[PDB]
Amino acid sequence: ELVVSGKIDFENAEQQYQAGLAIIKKQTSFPLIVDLKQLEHGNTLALAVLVQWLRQTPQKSGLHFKNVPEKMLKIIQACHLQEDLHL
Amino acid sequence: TIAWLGRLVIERIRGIGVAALMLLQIIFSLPSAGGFGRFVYQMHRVGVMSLLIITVSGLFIGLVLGLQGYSILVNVGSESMLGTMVSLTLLRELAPVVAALLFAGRAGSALTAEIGSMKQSEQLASMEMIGVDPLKQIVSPRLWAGIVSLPMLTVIFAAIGIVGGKLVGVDFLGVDEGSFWSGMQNNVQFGHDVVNGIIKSIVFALLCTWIAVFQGYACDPTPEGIATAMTRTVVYSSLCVLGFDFVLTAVMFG
Amino acid sequence: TIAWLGRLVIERIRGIGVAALMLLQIIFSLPSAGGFGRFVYQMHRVGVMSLLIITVSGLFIGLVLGLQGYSILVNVGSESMLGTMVSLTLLRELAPVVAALLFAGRAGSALTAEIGSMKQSEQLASMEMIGVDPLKQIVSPRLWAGIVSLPMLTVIFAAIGIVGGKLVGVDFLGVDEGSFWSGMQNNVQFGHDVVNGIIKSIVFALLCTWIAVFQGYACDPTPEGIATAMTRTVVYSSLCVLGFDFVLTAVMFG
Amino acid sequence: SLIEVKNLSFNRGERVIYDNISLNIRRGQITAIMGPSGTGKTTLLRLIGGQLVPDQGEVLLDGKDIAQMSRQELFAARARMGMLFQSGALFTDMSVYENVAFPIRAHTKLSENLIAELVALKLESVGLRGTEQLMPTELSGGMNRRVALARAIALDPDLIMYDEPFAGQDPIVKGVLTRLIRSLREALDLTTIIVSHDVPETLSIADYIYVVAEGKIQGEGTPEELQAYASPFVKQFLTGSAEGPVEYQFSHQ
Amino acid sequence: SLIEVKNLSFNRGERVIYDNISLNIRRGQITAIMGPSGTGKTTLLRLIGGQLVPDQGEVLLDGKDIAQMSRQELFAARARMGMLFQSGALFTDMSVYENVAFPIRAHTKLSENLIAELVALKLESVGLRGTEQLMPTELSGGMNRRVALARAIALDPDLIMYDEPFAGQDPIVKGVLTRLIRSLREALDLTTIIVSHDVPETLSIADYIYVVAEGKIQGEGTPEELQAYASPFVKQFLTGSAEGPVEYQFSHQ
C-alpha cells in the first residue's frame, strides 16, 4: 500500500498534502487502509490534510485509516461523534 | 439590494418628524416651574468654556483676510477698501458661519454626547420613575443656554476678526488709518448689517442646538450609538447651517 | 487651586511629544507591502463616503459667493470681477479651509471613534500576541486614506463652487460668459493659484488625519474617553488648520 | 510548558499593582487566580504573557528569560499561546472565517485550501460548524464568545488563558463553557489558566489555586488546602461572608 | 400593597417580548424572577407600572387600574416606589448628599433642616454616614450601589425593585447586598422584587419564584416547588446543565 508518513507540520504541509494527492491520482484500486502509526503526534493540521484527501476520493470511494494514534482520535471526538470509527 | 436605500431614507425622514415634535414639546415656557440657577450653570459649559476656541479662530481669520485683501488691493491701488471689506466680510458672511461651525462644532458634539450618555446610563429613566419630567431638568436649560450663547459668541468672533484685520492691514502694511475707519462707515451700518449678522446667528443657534439635543436624547440604547450620534450631529448641524445661510443671505441682501 | 492649570498644561503638552513619536513610527517604517493592498478598501470610509457632504457644501458656498460678490460688485465691476473673485476665493481660501473643516468633522470624528473602539474593546490589543503589529495592520491604511482623500475632495469642492458661482452670478443675475471665463484665465494662474490650493490641502490632510489617529489611540481605557476623544479631535484639528492656513497663505501670496 | 513568574513588580503610573508575586504555572494542570474586583487580575495575565514590561521581574518560558529573546525567538514563541479576552475581542470587520483563520497567517504560509480545512475543524470542535460566512456581529451571546475561543485554539497552542470566563451571567453558558474547558483540556493536552469571579465555579475546575489581593499572594493551595489554611482574608473571600477585613466610613456624634 | 399584572402583551421593535404574562406579587414577600439573559427582564419590570405602555392587559395597584385613573393620584402613587436600574444610576453632577436628597423634592416641601436630617439617616442605613460631600464619581463600585439604594428607600416606599443586583460582582459585595436586603425587608415592611441571572443566590432569598423565558411563564413555585417540576426548560435553566432544550450548530458531511 502507498501512504504518506512522518512528521506533518506547517513547514511541509503543502508537500505532504500533494504527495497524498499523487497517491490518490494513482489509486485505481481501493479500499486501501492508511496506516498512520508512523505519524508524529499533536498536530491538527495533519487532520486537515487527511480530511482534504478524504474530500477528493475516500468519501465516496470507501477508503479508510488504521492504527490511528489515540491522540488523533481524541481530537476528532471533541465533537465528530458520528465519525466512521470502524476498520 | 436597492430597497436598502429606500428604507434608510424613510427612516431618516420619520426621525425628523419626531424631532419636530420634541421641539414643540420643549419650547413652551414651562421651566419657570423650577429655579433657573441651573440655566446659569449650564451656560458655563456651552458658552464660557468655548471662548478660547472662538477667540483664537477669530484672530486668525482676521489676519488672513487682512493679508489676502491687501495683496489684491495693491493691484487696484485703493487701500480704503480694507476697512470696507474686512467689515463686510466678517459681519455678513464669516462671523455667522465660522462661529456656527466651530460652535457645533465643539459645543454641539459635547452636548450630544452628554445627553445621550444620560440616556444610556439609565439616569433619565430613573428621573421619570421618581416623577420629575426630564425635559424640564435635563433638556430645557441646555437648549436655551445654546440659544443665548452662540449669538453672543458670533459677535465676539467678528470683533476679534476686525481687530485682527486692522492689525495687519493697517499697522504692518502701511495703510493710512483714517481711511480704514472711514471705509467701515462708508457704507456698512450698525443698524442694518450688524443686525442681519445677528439674525442669522439666532437661526443657526436654534438649528445647531436643536439638533444636538435631539441626537443625544431620542435614541433607543444601542451601545455603539453614542459615537455614531456624535458624528451625526456634526454633519447635520453643518449642512443645516450652510443651507440656511444661503436662503437667508439671499433675502437680507437681495 | 492654581497648580491645577499647571498640571493640565504640562500633561497636554507631553501628549504632543507622544504623538510626534507615533507619527514617526508609522511613516518611517512600512515594509509590509503585501497587506497595503487593502488601503483601497479603507478609502471607502474616508473618501467615498464623504463626497455627499463636500459636494453639497461646495454648491452652497459657490452660490453664496455669487450673491454677495454681485451685490458689492455691481458698484465696481461685476462683468470682470465675478469671474476673478469667485475663482480666486475658492482656490486660495475656501476650498482648503471649508473642505478641510467639513472633513475634519465627518471623517475625523468617525475615524477617531473607530480607533477608539478598537482599543476599548481590547480587540486591538489581542493582535500583539499574534505577532501582528497593529500599526502596520490597523493604523497604516487609515492614515494613508486620509492623505489621498482630502486633496481630491478639496479639488471637487472648488469645482462645485465654480458651478455655483456661475449659476447665479452669470445665469440669473445678468453677466457675460465671455468676460467671466476670460477674466478667470487672465488672473488665475496654474502657477500658483491652483497649485497653492493643493499644497495647503496636503498640509492639512496630514495634520488633521494625524491628530485623529493619535487621539483615537488613547491611553486611558474608560468609556467616557471615547466621547472625549471625539470632541477633541474636532477641536484640535480645527484650530490647527486655521493656524497653519494663516502662515502658509502669508507666504504664498506675500 | 512550565512558566515561572518571580519577584514580579509592576506599577501603572505611580500606582503599585503588584509587589513580588511568585507563581508556578504547573504543566498540564489547570491553575486559577481568584481575588477581589479591580486588583489587577488582567494585569497579571498580561505580564505573564509578556505584553507589559515588568519592573525588575523575571519571567521564564521553559526556563528561558523572555527579556533576553531575539526577535525570531519571540515571534516563534507567540505561536505557543492563545487567549480569550473579557469582551471576546472579535474583529467586526471580518466574517467568522477570518476571525478564526487570522492567526494562521502570522506563522505559516499555507494554501488557501488547507487554511479553509483547519477553520472548518476548529469550528466543529466547539459546535460552530454552521456559522461559516456569517459576520460575527450577527451572533447571539453564547455563539459570539465561542468564536473567540476558537481563535485562541486555532494554532494548537500549549497554553490557553481565559480572562473572566465565568463572568457570563447565563446559567446555560456557564454549563457550556465549563464543558468546553474540560473537553479541550483533555483533547489537546492543554495547560490552562482561569482567572475569574463567582467562586462556586473556579473551585470545582482548577487543580491549583492562588488567591491574590492588594499586590500580594494571600494564600495558595488546592481547593481543600485553601480552606484548611484559610487565613481570615481568604476564608471570608472564598465564603462570600460578611464581616471580613472590609471597611466603610463610620463615626457618630 | 399587592400588585397584579394580567394578560400582559408587549411588542417592541416589531417583536413580542411578552405574551400573556400573569403575575401575583405577594405583599411583604420577596418575589423573584429568573430566566435567560436578553429576554425582557428589565422590560418586564418597567411594565410593572412604570413608563412603558402595554399593548394588552392591565396593571393593578391595590386592585385599581393605573391606566387613566387619575393624574394626581398617580403622581402621588409614584412616591411609593424605589429602584436600582442595571448598574445603578447616580447623577454625576450631584454630590452624594444631593443624590439621596433628590426624590424628596418631588413630593414634599420641607425645611433645609429636615431634608438634611433625612439624608443623614438614610445614608447610615446602608453604612454611608459621613460621605455626603464627596462627588459620587469618586466612590468605589461597592459604594455606588449603596448610594443608589439609599436614594431608592429615601421616601419610605413600599416597593423596592432590584434590577439584576447580583449579576456581576465581587463575592464580598454579594455578601453585603444580601444582608442589606434581609435587613431592609424587615426594617421597612417592604415588598421586594429581585430579578437576577445568578440562580444560586436567588434561590435562597426569594419566597416565591417565577421562571420566565421566550415571553411566557414556564413554571412557578417556591424554590422547593420549582425543583419538583422538571419541565426540560426549567430544569436545565435552574441547574446549569449544558444538556436540555438548547442548540449547537453542526452536521457532519
Ligand SMILES: Nc1ncnc2c1ncn2[C@@H]1O[C@H](COP(=O)(O)OP(=O)(O)NP(=O)(O)O)[C@@H](O)[C@H]1O
Ligand atoms: N496605560 C494605562 N494608563 C492608565 N491605566 C491603564 C493603562 N492601561 C491599562 N490601564 C489599567 O488597567 C488596569 C487593569 O486591571 P483591573 O483594573 O484589575 O481590571 P480587571 O482585571 O479586568 N478587573 P477584574 O475583572 O475584577 O479582574 C486598570 O486598573 C487600568 O487603570
Ligand SMILES: Nc1ncnc2c1ncn2[C@@H]1O[C@H](COP(=O)(O)OP(=O)(O)NP(=O)(O)O)[C@@H](O)[C@H]1O
Ligand atoms: N427603547 C427601546 N426601543 C427598541 N429596542 C430596545 C429599547 N431598549 C432596548 N432595546 C431592546 O429591547 C430589549 C431591552 O430589555 P431587556 O431584554 O429586558 O434587557 P435585559 O434582559 O435586562 N438585558 P440583559 O440585562 O443583558 O439580560 C432587548 O431585547 C434590546 O435589544
